[PDB]
Amino acid sequence: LGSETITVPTPIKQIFSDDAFAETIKDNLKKKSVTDAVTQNELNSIDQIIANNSDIKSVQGIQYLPNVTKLFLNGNKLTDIKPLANLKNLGWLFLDENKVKDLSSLKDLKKLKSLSLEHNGISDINGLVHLPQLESLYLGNNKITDITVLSRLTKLDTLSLEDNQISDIVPLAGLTKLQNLYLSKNHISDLRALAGLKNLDVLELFSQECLNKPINHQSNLVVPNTVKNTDGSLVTPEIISDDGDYEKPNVKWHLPEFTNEVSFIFYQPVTIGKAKARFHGRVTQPLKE
Ligand SMILES: [Zn+2]
Ligand SMILES: [Zn+2]
Ligand SMILES: [Zn+2]
């Protein structure tokens, strides 16, 4: 908008407050010093910013570059991203490894096609309702438990939710345009939601870790198997703790004088569309005295 253009020549150091960042602008327009002056035409000129691992704590000043389309800003020290809020022409925004937790500034970025926020400690991704046009979304290595908002992001061909804490992938059942789905290291016990996902080329389901609602230290104990495949059918465990034994459809046991938590491990090669993956994880079942 209006005073998100500078009208007299100005020195970099002054418009871009953060030193690291002021230097990515210098290094990008091939200038020789941050004290050198820049005119808005030159700023208008900038389409891409490559600034990974560059120790950037603030992108203030970025507001003055309204034709910027691709922002590579991984592994910096960003927390507040408001100066992006209004860069209408943004399509790639890479903010891995920062600490950006409030996605409200992305909300009017309606040309944004690919967003990455791996490893930011995000837990609420509901701000994503404001961005249905997304094509690639990388949300790996956060603390996301609820993905119900994703049933709306129907334009995705690439989605990574690897290493969060998802029990429930029913919200993905709809997203049939999906080609690469990474769901490793979550709490996924039921693969039914993926029956539909026919265009999948790459799919990952390693290391699920599913925990249960406690019961009690019984000599004869008999928990039912809840791990289900694509198509509804109970997957047969690839090993049980504590000379445990599986007769359909329960893990049985026999105890008194050892301890409090029991478990079983499962394994199942799956095929959905043109993709082949390994659904391998563990059902825990803790007990009390
Ligand atoms: Zn909002
Ligand atoms: Zn035994
Ligand atoms: Zn195994």
Curated annotation (Swiss-Prot):
Description of the deletion phenotype: Deletion of inlB alone decreases host cell entry; the reduction varies from 99% to 37% depending on the cell line tested.
Ranges for the LRR repeats: 43-65, 66-89, 91-109, 110-131, 132-155, 157-175, 176-199
Region (Ig-like region): 209-287
Localization (cell): Secreted; Cytoplasm; Cell membrane
Annotated ranges, domain LRRNT: 4-44
Family: Belongs to the internalin family.
Function: Mediates the entry of L.monocytogenes into normally non-phagocytic mammalian host cells. Its host receptor is hepatocyte growth factor receptor (HGF receptor, a tyrosine kinase, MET) which is tyrosine-phosphorylated in response to InlB. Downstream targets MAPK1/MAPK3 (Erk1/2) and AKT are phosphorylated in response to InlB, which also causes cell colony scattering. Complement component 1 Q subcomponent-binding protein (gC1q-R, C1QBP) has been suggested to also act an InlB receptor, but this is less certain.
Note on domains (UniProt): The N-terminus (36-79) resembles a truncated EF hand, the LRR region (80-240) has a curved form, while residues 241-321 form an Ig-like region; the whole region forms a curved tube. The LRR domain alone (31-241) binds mammalian MET and stimulates its Tyr-phosphorylation; the LRR plus Ig-like region (36-321) are required for receptor dimerization; adding the B-repeat allows the protein to scatter host cell colonies, and the GW domains, especially GW2 and GW3, potentiate MET activation.
Name by which UniProt lists this protein: Internalin B
Biological source species: Listeria monocytogenes serovar 1/2a (strain ATCC BAA-679 / EGD-e)
Source species taxonomy: Bacteria, Bacillati, Bacillota, Bacilli, Bacillales
Gene from which this protein is expressed: inlB
Entire protein: shown range: 36 to 321 of 630
